[PDB]
């Protein structure tokens, strides 16, 4: 079903990840976590206290597709175990973000063609940079067009909030 899949994103923040590559995804789905730079650090740290749910939906550069979506359970932290991650300097990163998976499989560009996003100038919402803060509405229906991922229970994430 899709309803705990609504009640996670009520009321949610959405954001728009841009990764240059497949490897860090991949490790962001096996160790549930993410870093970026400090301009998007700060952004996302202040959305984290402001909503019930704050929504990264990740997309690998060239792909021409979304890669999955997560939840951040955390603010940034320092001095965790370093992660291995592939730089287009390690040191010019900021922390590490936990993150719980909602769904880790995929959605094609060709999908979302229908939603634009109005904090982007209403352009399609699979255009922006890095950061891109994405409209509530927006943001919701494009979770709701990837397909269910049936590994997932959000019985654990709905506790967190």
Same mark, same amino acid.
């Not at 951040?72 to 965790?80: F, K, R, V």
């Not at 499989?105 to 100038?121: D, Y």
């Given at each position: 079903?899709? *309803?705990?899949?609504?009640?996670?994103? @009520?009321?949610?923040?959405?954001?728009? +990840? !841009?990764?240059? &590559?497949?490897?860090?995804?991949?490790?962001? !789905?096996? #160790? $549930?976590?993410?870093?970026?730079?400090?301009? &998007?650090? #700060?952004?996302?740290?202040?959305?984290?206290?402001?909503?019930?749910?704050?929504?990264?939906?990740? *997309?690998?550069?060239?792909?021409?597709?979304? @890669? $999955?979506?997560?939840?951040?359970?955390?603010?940034?932290?320092?001095?965790? *175990?370093?992660?291995?991650?592939?730089?287009?300097?390690?040191? /010019?990163?900021?922390?590490?973000?936990?993150?719980?998976?909602?769904?880790?499989?995929?959605?094609?560009?060709? !999908?979302?063609?229908?939603?634009? &996003?109005?904090?982007?100038?209403? #352009?399609?919402?699979?255009?922006?940079?890095?950061?891109?803060?994405?409209?509530?509405?927006?943001?919701? @229906?494009?979770?709701?067009?990837?397909?269910?991922?049936?590994?997932?229970?959000?019985? @654990?994430? +709905?506790? !967190? /909030?």
């Amino acid at each position: 079903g899709t *309803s705990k899949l609504k009640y996670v994103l @009520q009321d949610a923040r959405f954001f728009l +990840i !841009k990764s240059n &590559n497949h490897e860090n995804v991949s490790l962001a !789905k096996a #160790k $549930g976590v993410w870093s970026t730079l400090p301009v &998007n650090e #700060k952004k996302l740290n202040l959305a984290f206290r402001s909503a019930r749910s704050v929504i990264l939906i990740f *997309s690998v550069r060239e792909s021409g597709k979304f @890669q $999955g979506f997560a939840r951040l359970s955390s603010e940034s932290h320092h001095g965790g *175990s370093p992660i291995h991650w592939v730089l287009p300097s390690a040191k /010019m990163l900021g922390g590490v973000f936990k993150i719980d998976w909602i769904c880790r499989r995929e959605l094609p560009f060709t !999908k979302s063609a229908h939603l634009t &996003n109005p904090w982007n100038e209403h #352009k399609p919402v699979k255009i922006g940079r890095d950061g891109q803060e994405i409209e509530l509405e927006c943001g919701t @229906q494009l979770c709701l067009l990837f397909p269910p991922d049936e590994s997932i229970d959000l019985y @654990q994430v +709905i506790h !967190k /909030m």
